[PDB]
Amino acid sequence: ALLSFERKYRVPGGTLVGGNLFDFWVGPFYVGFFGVATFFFAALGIILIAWSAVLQGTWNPQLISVYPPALEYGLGGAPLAKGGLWQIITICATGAFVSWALREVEICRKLGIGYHIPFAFAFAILAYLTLVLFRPVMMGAWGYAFPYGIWTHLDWVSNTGYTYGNFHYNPAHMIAISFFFTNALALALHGALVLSAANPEKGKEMRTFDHEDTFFRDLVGYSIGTLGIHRLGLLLSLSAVFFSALCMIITGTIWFDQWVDWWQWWVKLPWWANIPGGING
Amino acid sequence: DLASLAIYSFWIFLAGLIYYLQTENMREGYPLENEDGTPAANQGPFPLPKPKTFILPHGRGTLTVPGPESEDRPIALARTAVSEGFPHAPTGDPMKDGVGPASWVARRDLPELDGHGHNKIKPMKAAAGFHVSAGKNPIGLPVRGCDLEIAGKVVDIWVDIPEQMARFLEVELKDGSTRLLPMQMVKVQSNRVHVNALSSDLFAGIPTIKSPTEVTLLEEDKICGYVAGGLMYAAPKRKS
Amino acid sequence: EYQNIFSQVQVRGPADLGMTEDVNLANRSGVGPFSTLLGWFGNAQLGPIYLGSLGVLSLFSGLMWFFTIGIWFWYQAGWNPAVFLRDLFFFSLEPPAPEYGLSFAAPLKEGGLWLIASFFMFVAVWSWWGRTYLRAQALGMGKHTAWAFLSAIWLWMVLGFIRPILMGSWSEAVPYGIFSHLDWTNNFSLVHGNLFYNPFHGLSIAFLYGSALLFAMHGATILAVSRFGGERELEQIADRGTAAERAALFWRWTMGFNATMEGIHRWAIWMAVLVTLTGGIGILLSGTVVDNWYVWGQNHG
Numbered sequence: 138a139l140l141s142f143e144r145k146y147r148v149p150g151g152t153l154v155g156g157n158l159f160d161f162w163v164g165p166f167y168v169g170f171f172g173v174a175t176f177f178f179a180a181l182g183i184i185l186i187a188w189s190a191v192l193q194g195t196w197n198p199q200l201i202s203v204y205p206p207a208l209e210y211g212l213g214g215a216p217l218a219k220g221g222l223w224q225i226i227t228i229c230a231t232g233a234f235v236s237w238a239l240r241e242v243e244i245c246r247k248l249g250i251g252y253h254i255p256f257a258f259a260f261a262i263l264a265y266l267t268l269v270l271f272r273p274v275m276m277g278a279w280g281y282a283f284p285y286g287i288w289t290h291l292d293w294v295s296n297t298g299y300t301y302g303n304f305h306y307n308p309a310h311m312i313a314i315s316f317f318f319t320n321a322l323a324l325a326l327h328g329a330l331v332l333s334a335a336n337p338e339k340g341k342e343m344r345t346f347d348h349e350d351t352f353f354r355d356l357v358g359y360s361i362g363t364l365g366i367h368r369l370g371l372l373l374s375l376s377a378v379f380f381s382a383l384c385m386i387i388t389g390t391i392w393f394d395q396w397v398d399w400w401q402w403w404v405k406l407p408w409w410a411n412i413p414g415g416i417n418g
Numbered sequence: 419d420l421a422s423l424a425i426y427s428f429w430i431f432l433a434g435l436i437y438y439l440q441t442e443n444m445r446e447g448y449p450l451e452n453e454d455g456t457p458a459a460n461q462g463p464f465p466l467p468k469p470k471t472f473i474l475p476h477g478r479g480t481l482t483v484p485g486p487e488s489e490d491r492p493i494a495l496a497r498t499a500v501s502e503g504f505p506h507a508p509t510g511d512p513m514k515d516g517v518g519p520a521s522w523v524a525r526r527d528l529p530e531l532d533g534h535g536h537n538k539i540k541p542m543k544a545a546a547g548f549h550v551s552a553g554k555n556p557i558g559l560p561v562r563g564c565d566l567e568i569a570g571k572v573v574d575i576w577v578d579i580p581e582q583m584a585r586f587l588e589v590e591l592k593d594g595s596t597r598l599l600p601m602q603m604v605k606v607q608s609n610r611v612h613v614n615a616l617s618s619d620l621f622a623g624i625p626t627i628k629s630p631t632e633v634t635l636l637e638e639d640k641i642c643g644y645v646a647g648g649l650m651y652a653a654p655k656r657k658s
Numbered sequence: 659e660y661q662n663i664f665s666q667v668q669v670r671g672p673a674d675l676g677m678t679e680d681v682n683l684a685n686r687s688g689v690g691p692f693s694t695l696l697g698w699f700g701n702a703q704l705g706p707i708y709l710g711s712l713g714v715l716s717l718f719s720g721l722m723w724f725f726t727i728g729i730w731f732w733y734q735a736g737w738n739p740a741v742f743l744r745d746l747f748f749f750s751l752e753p754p755a756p757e758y759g760l761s762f763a764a765p766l767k768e769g770g771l772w773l774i775a776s777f778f779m780f781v782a783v784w785s786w787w788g789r790t791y792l793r794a795q796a797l798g799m800g801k802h803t804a805w806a807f808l809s810a811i812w813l814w815m816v817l818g819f820i821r822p823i824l825m826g827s828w829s830e831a832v833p834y835g836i837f838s839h840l841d842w843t844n845n846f847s848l849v850h851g852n853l854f855y856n857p858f859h860g861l862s863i864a865f866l867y868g869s870a871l872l873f874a875m876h877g878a879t880i881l882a883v884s885r886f887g888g889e890r891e892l893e894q895i896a897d898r899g900t901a902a903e904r905a906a907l908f909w910r911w912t913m914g915f916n917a918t919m920e921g922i923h924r925w926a927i928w929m930a931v932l933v934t935l936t937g938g939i940g941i942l943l944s945g946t947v948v949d950n951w952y953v954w955g956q957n958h959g
């Protein structure tokens with residue numbers, strides 16, 4: 138149950154709450170207070186989803202779906218079968234994720250490493266909280282949040298999108314997509330570079346960092362280095378999820394028309410707004 | 419049809435890819451052990467992979483993983499409970515013994531070389547043509563601990579020559595002896611370098627290098643280990 | 659404490675001319691300027707780029723594809739630069755109409771310029787790919803970068819070439835334009851019964867989401883262990899240090915399992931590669947074998 142090198146690291150300390158009460162492991166898993174918290178919120182939430190499966194009449198995971206309260210309920214409570222189960226499960230989910238992050242912080246302190254991981258995860262939590270919480274509250278009803286089901290949540294994506302035409306035209310959405318595409322490009326290259334240095338042509342010696350640096354200079358004229366590519370990856374990723382949250386927080390709130398028509402601010406700039414020719418004249 | 423043959427084939431491909439990926443990631447640290455160092459009974463469903471051999475670059479030899487695993491050092495720890503899964507207490511001073519957040523590994527006692535076979539990390543005085551080009555120059559700055567006392571002063575920057583990057587500050591103590599602090603654990607300020615991890619009275623205890631013009635991979639690990647460990651262990655002496 | 663997102667102190671020395679190995683030093687350029695701006699994040703050196711024979715072929719073709727679209731955008735703008743800048747995202751170089759099929763005999767103002775620009779892009783990309791392979795052979799490194807790039811080439815190759823050919827028409831290909839290639843993408847989903855129902859499309863999404871997940875994890879992990887010199891990954895593979903151990907142990911204690919310093923980069927290269935791999939299969943099957951992914955999904959077959 139231990140990695141060969143692991144024992145020297147399994148010392149007491151680092152917990153944020155409850156001293157040495159929960160300072161122990163179950164197999165590979167660290168527990169901690171927030172380990173216990175995560176189990177509670179995760180058990181409860183899973184129980185409520187099962188109880189929501191009987192109210193619907195399916196034990197089929199491709200069919201099961203927990204919906205928000207309909208718009209009529211506003212930002213108020215709802216009967217369980219009619220939206221209150223979603224509302225409670227949502228509180229349970231938020232509890233599971235925040236507890237998971239804070240559990241990552243306790244693991245960080247015992248290992249004496251930095252806090253970059255819990256920090257990155259909180260951007261994911263933030264995107265979720267934008268969809269199920271922030272945008273609903275700004276809009277005035279829980280019903281605008283997405284449903285918890287495998288395909289029904291895809292339905293919401295599609296219908297919420299096309300409420301505004303081709304959703305391609307949300308400018309924050311454009312930026313978000315660029316970071317996602319760019320991040321995957323960077324992850325491919327970084328992975329490929331390290332592996333090509335560690336795993337050279339047969340019989341050759343293991344290459345070095347300088348070979349990595351040379352390769353990328355040979356190729357594109359620049360190289361960012363070891364610290365920089367890990368700073369770049371963390372940043373392309375965190376930025377993608379940032380602009381995703383942004384593109385949704387502005388949709389249905391400060392902009393509620395067709396997204397393609399937003400782009401008329403550009404074309405009707407008065408110095409060229411009237412000139413003939415082109416596509417828009 | 420063709421489509422559902424493709425998707426079914428893909429899922430089988432992916433399972434074998436996961437298998438391959440997981441066994442690849444078992445070339446260190448495995449086999450699993452009981453807290454006493456004996457092989458654990460339950461290794462899980464994945465087998466150890468066929469070993470592979472890296473030919474290291476500069477006549478430095480060979481690495482074959484998976485291989486025989488051992489800490490080439492004493493671990494000053496004791497069980498706090500009669501059953502598996504609980505913390506193991508330090509039996510001495512965890513900073514000195516190198517346990518917990520203060521851990522190091524018995525890395526090779528040579529320095530890392532570059533692609534041309536020269537020491538990757540040099541002091542800047544011994545580094546031909548290298549100068550501070552941006553930001554505050556730390557050299558000559560006093561160094562403060564987490565108890566707000568001065569521990570020493572910066573007398574050079576050790577640089578990564580290939581990466582062209584500061585990795586250590588060399589610090590002179592009231593001894594007249596020097597130590598290395600890792601760059602990633604210091605705050606270079608206007609009038610001082612601040613060190614949160616350590617209090618002034620623990621700077622003497624930082625492991626020393628045996629030649630003054632190179633660090634070894636073993637020594638980097640003992641130094642970075644020591645100073646990181648202070649976040650936990652020097653927390654009595656931490657004020658702000 | 660210090661977080662390590664930007665360097666506190668930059669340090670410069672002699673321009674690095676690189677490792678020689680088998681590279682024709684005659685084809686390398688001279689080290690360009692040092693960017694202080696870039697060096698807060700990565701390296702300052704905008705040093706030497708290798709421009710061989712394939713590199714020049716690629717760069718010429720690329721500018722040709724790029725200019726072919728550009729003159730056409732001007733012809734649409736009426737050669738008026740104000741209209742050019744007003745309607746820039748609206749211009750489009752469209753493929754030949756379904757009439758001309760997979761033929762090359764077709765007027766320039768009806769898809770001829772499209773064929774031309776596409777030929778230039780085709781040679782620009784494949785030569786650059788060969789360059790990626792050859793650049794690595796010179797240094798004696800493995801061909802990983804060339805394989806991962808082949809995967810991106812796959813999706814591209816399918817969209818503009820392979821799939822237009824199996825439909826028997828160049829009109830099925832993507833046009834050159836900012837707003838138009840977006841419209842083509844929305845239109846494609848609509849015409850194939852909603853791509854959300856394509857099981858390859860949803861796998862592609864899992865991998866794209868997972869790429870951001872992995873790199874967030876990995877990058878954040880290397881930063882957290884950079885106080886033990888974790889970023890020097892290649893040496894940490896040959897001689898595991900405490901950086902690699904507390905990195906593995908963070909994740910073992912969090913989610914019950916872990917990677918190695920080498921192993922995490924196999925996870926990485928694959929997670930990304932599978933984005934465009936499954937993606938290219940999903941597009942290739944659309945309109946050749948499956949007309950409507952809603953229908954297919956009702957009786958898989």
Ligand code: BCL
Nearest residue numbers: 305310311312314315316318319814817832836839840843
């Ligand atoms: C993938 C499936 C669809 C498709 C769907 C989409 C969707 C959906 C979107 C794009 C977007 C983009 N597409 Mg497309 N696109 C496809 C195939 C392509 C191909 C090709 C196969 O050869 C090319 C050359 C492009 C090129 C482009 C870019 C113009 C843009 C961002 C690219 C990027 O970030 O990559 C990373 C690669 C790099 C080299 C780094 C680039 C980083 C910076 C410099 C780019 C900033 C762009 C920013 C958002 C501003 C946009 C305005 C214009 C630049 C004026 N697409 C097919 C047809 N594409 C986004 C867009 O913003 O369009 C307007 C967008 O929302």
Ligand code: BCL
Nearest residue numbers: 265283287288290291294859860861863864865867868871
């Ligand atoms: C993110 C923006 C949109 C959205 C748009 C899409 C689109 C578009 C698609 C998905 C797809 C998926 N979505 Mg979604 N989805 C949203 C929000 C979520 C959230 C949430 C915020 O909590 C969750 C849990 C999911 C989960 C999922 C997966 C079922 C699936 C692949 C995920 C993946 O590979 O990511 C990367 C992550 C990993 C590899 C880590 C492992 C994550 C695993 C696989 C998640 C499984 C959990 C699931 C079965 C629920 C368990 C709950 C209880 C524990 C029982 N989505 C919102 C509404 N989602 C794709 C799909 O295939 O639909 C069927 C797809 O095409």
Ligand code: BCL
Nearest residue numbers: 261262264265294295297298303304305313314381382385
């Ligand atoms: C027809 C559909 C519409 C459209 C409508 C929308 C709408 C509407 C939305 C998007 C959103 C997104 N769109 Mg869109 N979109 C379209 C076409 C595209 C195209 C394209 C055509 O090529 C692309 C590439 C994208 C890309 C994107 C992303 C920028 C973004 C999703 C990422 C995200 O938010 O992660 C964020 C990640 C999360 C919320 C996940 C959080 C995970 C949490 C914290 C933890 C989960 C734990 C789990 C439960 C536990 C599992 C335990 C087990 C052990 C595994 N869209 C068209 C035009 N798009 C979404 C967005 O931008 O913001 C959300 C969104 O809501």
Ligand code: BCL
Nearest residue numbers: 810811814843844846847853854859862863866937940941
């Ligand atoms: C209304 C829109 C439709 C839809 C229609 C499509 C279509 C159509 C396609 C996708 C595709 C994709 N979609 Mg979809 N999609 C929708 C909604 C979504 C949502 C969402 C709702 O949240 C998400 C997350 C996605 C996500 C995704 C991606 C997983 C996938 C593209 C992978 C990629 O990285 O290509 C980016 C990478 C490339 C194109 C590689 C090409 C690179 C080449 C080799 C070189 C380019 C550079 C060139 C040389 C020029 C140089 C320029 C430089 C700047 C110098 N879609 C809805 C249902 N989607 C693609 C797919 O794979 O489907 C299975 C696809 O073709």
Ligand SMILES: CC[C@H]1c2cc3[nH]c4c(c3C)C(=O)[C@H](C(=O)OC)c4c3nc(cc4[nH]c(cc(n2)[C@@H]1C)c(C(C)=O)c4C)[C@@H](C)[C@@H]3CCC(=O)OC/C=C(\C)CCC[C@H](C)CCC[C@H](C)CCCC(C)C
Nearest residue numbers: 318321322325326720721782783786806807810930931934
């Ligand atoms: C698994 C697929 C993912 C991925 C991976 C990937 N892409 C790759 C690779 C890999 C592993 C490479 O090794 C290769 C690369 O070279 O990386 C730097 C590449 C590459 N992916 C690129 C783009 C790209 N990849 C994309 C996507 C993806 N690539 C996915 C995220 C996209 C998307 C999202 O659509 C784009 C936009 C290129 C940067 C590069 C291949 C470049 C190429 O082949 O083009 C040849 C050259 C030209 C067309 C140049 C002319 C056009 C220019 C606009 C002119 C300016 C150039 C120059 C500055 C002119 C100078 C002239 C004088 C003034 C001196």
Ligand SMILES: CC[C@H]1c2cc3[nH]c4c(c3C)C(=O)[C@H](C(=O)OC)c4c3nc(cc4[nH]c(cc(n2)[C@@H]1C)c(C(C)=O)c4C)[C@@H](C)[C@@H]3CCC(=O)OC/C=C(\C)CCC[C@H](C)CCC[C@H](C)CCCC(C)C
Nearest residue numbers: 182229230233234237257258260261286287867870871874
């Ligand atoms: C910057 C954001 C990017 C990112 C990063 C990221 N995610 C992270 C981390 C980081 C840095 C971690 O440290 C953490 C991790 O532990 O990874 C292994 C994590 C994590 N990201 C996860 C998923 C995830 N991340 C996503 C996205 C992103 N994560 C981005 C790419 C997605 C997307 C793209 O959709 C998913 C699916 C988990 C694997 C993990 C967090 C695990 C966790 O929180 O455990 C606590 C909770 C439970 C055990 C289950 C509780 C169940 C609920 C109570 C009920 C179910 C409610 C739910 C709403 C159901 C909805 C399902 C339907 C929509 C189908």
Ligand SMILES: COC(C)(C)C/C=C/C(C)=C/C=C/C(C)=C/C=C/C(C)=C\C=C\C=C(C)\C=C\C=C(/C)CC/C=C(\C)CCC=C(C)C
Nearest residue numbers: 724727728776777780814815817818819832834835836839
């Ligand atoms: C300022 O003015 C100047 C002079 C600088 C010029 C300005 C230029 C501008 C404004 C250019 C703008 C170009 C744009 C915006 C291009 C956009 C492209 C987009 C958004 C997407 C690209 C998708 C294209 C793909 C999928 C193409 C795939 C092509 C192939 C797979 C190969 C095609 C091959 C063909 C048809 C046959 C070739 C022949 C053989 C058999 C070898």
Ligand SMILES: CCCCCCCCCCCC[N+](C)(C)[O-]
Nearest residue numbers: 357358359687688689690704707
């Ligand atoms: C950010 C990427 C920039 C890539 C272009 C710059 C790198 C190549 C510089 C070559 C300059 C050469 N010189 C001096 C001989 O002309």
Ligand SMILES: CCCCCCCCCCCC[N+](C)(C)[O-]
Nearest residue numbers: 430431432433434435436438439
């Ligand atoms: C079990 C049936 C066969 C499944 C095949 C899956 C293969 C996945 C890739 C593993 C081999 C990896 N590789 C290419 C690096 O050697």
Ligand SMILES: CCCCCCCCCCCC[N+](C)(C)[O-]
Nearest residue numbers: 165436440461462463464914915
């Ligand atoms: C995307 C998730 C992929 C899961 C791959 C398999 C994860 C479990 C691996 C367990 C191996 C480790 N252990 C603890 C037995 O040593």
Ligand SMILES: CCCCCCCCCCCC[N+](C)(C)[O-]
Nearest residue numbers: 164165166462463910913914915
């Ligand atoms: C692909 C669907 C989601 C897969 C989730 C897999 C969870 C992996 C966690 C297993 C950890 C196992 N172990 C060995 C510690 O017991």
Ligand SMILES: [Fe+3]
Nearest residue numbers: 327331880891
């Ligand atoms: Fe890495």
